[PDB]
Amino acid sequence: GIVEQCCTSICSLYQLENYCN
Amino acid sequence: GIVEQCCTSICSLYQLENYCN
Amino acid sequence: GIVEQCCTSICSLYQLENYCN
Amino acid sequence: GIVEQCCTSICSLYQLENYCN
Amino acid sequence: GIVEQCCTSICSLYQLENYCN
Amino acid sequence: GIVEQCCTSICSLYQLENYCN
Amino acid sequence: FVNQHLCGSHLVEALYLVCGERGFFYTPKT
Amino acid sequence: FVNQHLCGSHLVEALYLVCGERGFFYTPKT
Amino acid sequence: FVNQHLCGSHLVEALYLVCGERGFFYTPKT
Amino acid sequence: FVNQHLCGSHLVEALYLVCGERGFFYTPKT
Amino acid sequence: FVNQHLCGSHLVEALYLVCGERGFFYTPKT
Amino acid sequence: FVNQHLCGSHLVEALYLVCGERGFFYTPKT
Ligand SMILES: [Cl-]
Ligand SMILES: [Cl-]
Ligand SMILES: [Zn+2]
Ligand SMILES: [Zn+2]
Structure with missing residues (x-):
């Protein structure tokens, strides 16, 4: 998931924004 | 400057990009 | 909520666990 | 010690609490 | 103490070294 | 540069200070 | 442990x- | 914005x- | 995204x- | 509480x- | 270097x- | 002061x- 992806790979702020409430 | 824009007043992530190189 | 419980007022690490999944 | 253990292995908050004054 | 020296009033990095072991 | 050196190797605060404005 | 003010990123x-791994929600609107 | 390499608390x-004020949920695997 | 107060180290x-890699300048004197 | 994997400043x-207010001592090896 | 307010986790x-490796004590009660 | 091993946001x-108030510029390679 995002937690793993940002750490093992890269992730974008736009992808992060999907986890906002 | 950035402190006035983002700390004293509020700024978006986009405004923060104003201070990228 | 958490901000009122832990920022505005103070909370323990145990109260913080209230917001775990 | 704790500094190494938390980093090379894992450590618990309870173990951390032993370093409080 | 450190809080009075560095938080309440201001301190340099050198004064911070006062609290090293 | 400094960003890489501090991360891949080590760097000192004195070296860091060269990046101050 | 202790009680302190914990705000924002902190x-x-x-x-x-x-x-940690349980995950959590941060829902300041509440 | 640039892509991010973010572990742990980062x-x-x-x-x-x-x-921001919307807050978010943090849901690691396992 | 959102607008919040971002101060100091934050x-x-x-x-x-x-x-990120673009780099940035932080020039509080302005 | 969960177990922690904490390096450096973390x-x-x-x-x-x-x-909290008790403070603490930070004593790495060597 | 400089003098600034350094509080709490900061x-x-x-x-x-x-x-760093010397270690330190943080003893806010003082 | 001690030497530093600092990655990323650290x-x-x-x-x-x-x-401090002088601010600084952050200029990674590439
Ligand atoms: Cl703060
Ligand atoms: Cl890290
Ligand atoms: Zn802070
Ligand atoms: Zn880190």
Whole structure:
């Protein structure tokens, strides 16, 4: 998931924004 | 400057990009 | 909520666990 | 010690609490 | 103490070294 | 540069200070 | 442990610390 | 914005900055 | 995204997040 | 609470959150 | 270098930075 | 002061603490 992806790979702020409430 | 824009007043992530190189 | 419980007022690490999944 | 253990292995908050004054 | 020296009033990095072991 | 050196190797605060404005 | 004011990023850092793999929600609107 | 390499609590900081008052949920695997 | 107060180290952490490899300048005198 | 994997300054943050007003001592090897 | 207000977690992060392997004590009661 | 091993946002924190009101520029390779 995002937690793993940002750490093992890269992730974008736009992808992060999907986890906002 | 950035402190006035983002700390004293509020700024978006986009405004923060104003201070990228 | 958490901000009122832990920022505005103070909370323990145990109260913080209230917001775990 | 704790500094190494938390980093090379894992450590618990309870173990951390032993370093409080 | 450190809080009075560095938080309440201001301190340099050198004064911070006062609290090293 | 400094960003890489501090991360891949080590760097000192004195070296860091060269990046101050 | 103790009770302190935990605000903003510090609050979420504390949640991360306290919840870790369980995960957590930070819902300031509440 | 640039892509991010974020581990541990740095992911939580980023979510915090990204989501602001909306807050967010942090849900690691396992 | 959102607008929040970003001060001090938090401001530079946000710049790091937002600029990353581009780099950035933090010039509070302005 | 969950177990922690904490390096560098993250250990110090954790000690800070754990100890609060008691403070703490940070004593790495060597 | 400079003088600034260093409080809370930021103070201990600064101590970690400044002391590193020497270690340090954070004793706010004093 | 001790030598530092600083990656990612930790470098930016350090620059922040080192430079204070002077601010600083963060310029990674590439
Ligand atoms: Cl703060
Ligand atoms: Cl890290
Ligand atoms: Zn802070
Ligand atoms: Zn880190």
